């Protein structure tokens, strides 16, 4: 079990002004630290955030959080479930900011909600240094769905934060799971939502922040571009491993894809997997199976899926070795077959 701590700096809050926090299980014999960002979509105006507050309140508020959480998948402490990092210090950071982890905005007389995801990450890192993170050799910032996009937006800032605090020795890395999306045309048009327009409104609503080099490329008004993995990844300096289903359920949802499939839709889906494969061609550490699914790394059976005969925990161990061209220890694993479940190890 991972145990809840609410932030001692209570100015760093969830959407409704309640304190943010983190769940922690320490490992006294290890110098590896895993900080996992939870996902769960987002909201981009008052009406849509009010609706989220009615029926998704744990993603907006710490008031009803439980005192413990069980670690699963890469957060499990059992070697059988987590061959990769079972002996690490484990941190689960709940997503209570609805801002894809990008916001730096307080609740006030002009703001009904606080959007503080970027500051929550920085504050967790700060309070953990006093609980052992100061002795770390690797800090892996991981996340799924909106949390995976959050890794891409925040990993370089965590690294800069530790260098300026006097800890250049800690190596910061990222693991981004199911957060690599395409700003493509929808299969059938709808009213807002297309990924592009939703992010454009959210950034303004949240006062969202993006990594500095990506901001300097796209410039004022065009920062939404840095929320799209294939645009922000080349600007990053920290090592980042990318996990992405070729046919992500959330990608299909925003594309309005839901009997025998007709030619138009077949071609749309095949072109979608081809485009995803193309954006990964120059990402050296990546794992991308040809499956219709969503998230993987905190699933209890994450050990089951394979690409070219190598599982995800093995690929991540090979990545570790590469950061010390390996024989039989690959790190770039992208399926080439063109339809969902052409890979027999896909989740059922
Ligand atoms: O299921 C979740 O948590 C998320 C789903 C999506 C996210 S996050 C997103 C993050 C950046 C850019 C475009 C998108 C649209 C799809
Ligand atoms: C609390 O967090 C806010 C927002 O990041 C920051 O400005 C302030 O310095 C913090 N206070 C302390 C005592 O750490």
Nearest ligand by distance to the CA of 123: 2
Across-strand partners of 171? 138
Residues with Cβ within 6 A of ligand 2?
A: 9, 11-12, 119
Would you call 202 helix, strand, or coil by DSSP? Answer: helix
For residue 170, give both structure tokens: 């800690």
Closest CA to 280 of 320, 234, 232, 334: 334
The coordinates were experimentally obtained by X-ray
Q: Which of 99, 248, 255, 335 is catalytic?
A: 248
Q: Whose CA is nearest to atom 6 of ligand 2?
A: 11
CA 245 / ligand 1 centre spacing (Å):
14
Measured CA distances, 319 to 64, 221, 284 (Å): 38, 36, 10
CB atoms within 10 A of CB 186: 14
56 lines ligand 1 (CB under 6 A): no
Kindly state if the Cβ of 41 falls inside 6 Å of ligand 1. yes
Q: Which of 182, 26, 209 is closest to 100 using CA atoms?
A: 209
- Domain span at 277: 1-348
Q: Look at the chain and report how many structural domains it folds into.
A: 1
Q: Which of 18, 145, 286, 311 is catalytic?
A: 145
DSSP 116-180: -HHHHHHHHHHHHHTTTGGG-SEEEEEEETHHHHHHHHHHHHHHHHHHHTT-TTSEEEEEEES--
CB 99 within 8 A of CB 111: no
Q: How far is the CA of 238 from the centre of ligand 2 (A)?
A: 25
322 is catalytic: no
Q: Which residue, by CA, sits nearest to atom 5 of ligand 2?
A: 119
Give the other-Cβ count within 10 Å of 260's Cβ.
5
Determine whether 294 is an active site residue: yes
- Among residues 237, 239, 212, the alpha carbon closest in space to that of 226 is found at 212
Q: Give CA–CA dist 240/316, Å, rounded.
A: 11
How far, in Å, from the CA of 289 to the mean position of ligand 1?
Answer: 19
Tell me the ligand closest to 161's alpha carbon.
2
178 lines ligand 1 (CB under 6 A): no
Mutate to test the pocket of ligand 1, among 195, 225, 249, 296 (most ligand atoms within 8 A of CB): 195
Q: What stretches of the chain show up as alpha helix (H) in DSSP?
A: 46-55, 117-129, 146-164, 195-206, 212-218, 229-232, 249-254, 263-279, 312-322
Q: Answer whether 182's CB lies under 8 Å from 176's CB.
A: no
């Amino acid at each position: 079990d991972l145990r809840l701590h609410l932030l001692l700096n209570t100015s760093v809050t969830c959407n409704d002004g309640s304190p943010a926090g983190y769940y922690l299980k320490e490992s006294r014999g290890s110098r590896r630290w895993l900080l996992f960002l939870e996902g769960g979509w987002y909201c981009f105006n008052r009406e849509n955030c009010d609706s989220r507050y009615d029926t998704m309140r744990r993603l907006m508020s710490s008031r009803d959080w439980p005192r413990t959480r069980t670690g699963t998948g890469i957060l499990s402490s059992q070697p059988e479930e987590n061959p990769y990092w079972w002996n690490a210090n484990m941190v689960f950071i709940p997503y209570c900011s609805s801002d894809v982890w990008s916001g730096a905005s307080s609740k006030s007389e002009k703001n009904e909600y606080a959007f503080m995801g970027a500051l929550i990450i920085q504050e967790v890192v700060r309070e953990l240094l006093g609980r052992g993170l100061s002795g770390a050799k690797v800090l892996l910032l991981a996340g799924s769905s909106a949390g995976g996009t959050g890794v891409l937006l925040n990993v370089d800032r965590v690294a800069e934060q530790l260098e300026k605090l006097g800890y250049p020795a800690i190596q910061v890395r990222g693991l981004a799971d199911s957060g690599w999306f395409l700003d493509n045309k929808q299969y059938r048009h709808t009213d807002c939502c297309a990924p592009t327009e939703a992010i454009r409104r959210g950034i303004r609503y949240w006062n969202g922040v993006v990594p500095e080099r990506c901001r300097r490329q796209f410039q004022e008004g065009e920062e939404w571009n840095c929320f799209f993995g294939y645009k922000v990844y080349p600007t990053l300096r920290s090592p980042v491993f990318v996990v992405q289903w070729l046919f992500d359920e959330a990608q299909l949802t925003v594309d309005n894809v839901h009997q025998p499939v007709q030619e138009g839709l077949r071609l749309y889906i095949q072109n979608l997997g081809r485009e995803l494969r193309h954006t990964l061609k120059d990402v050296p550490a990546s794992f991308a199976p040809a499956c219709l699914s969503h998230e993987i790394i905190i699933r209890s059976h994450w050990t089951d899926v394979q690409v070219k005969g190598t599982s995800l925990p093995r690929a991540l161990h090979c990545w570790d070795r590469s950061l010390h061209p390996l024989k039989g220890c690959p790190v770039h694993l992208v399926d080439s077959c063109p339809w969902p479940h052409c890979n027999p190890s896909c989740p059922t």
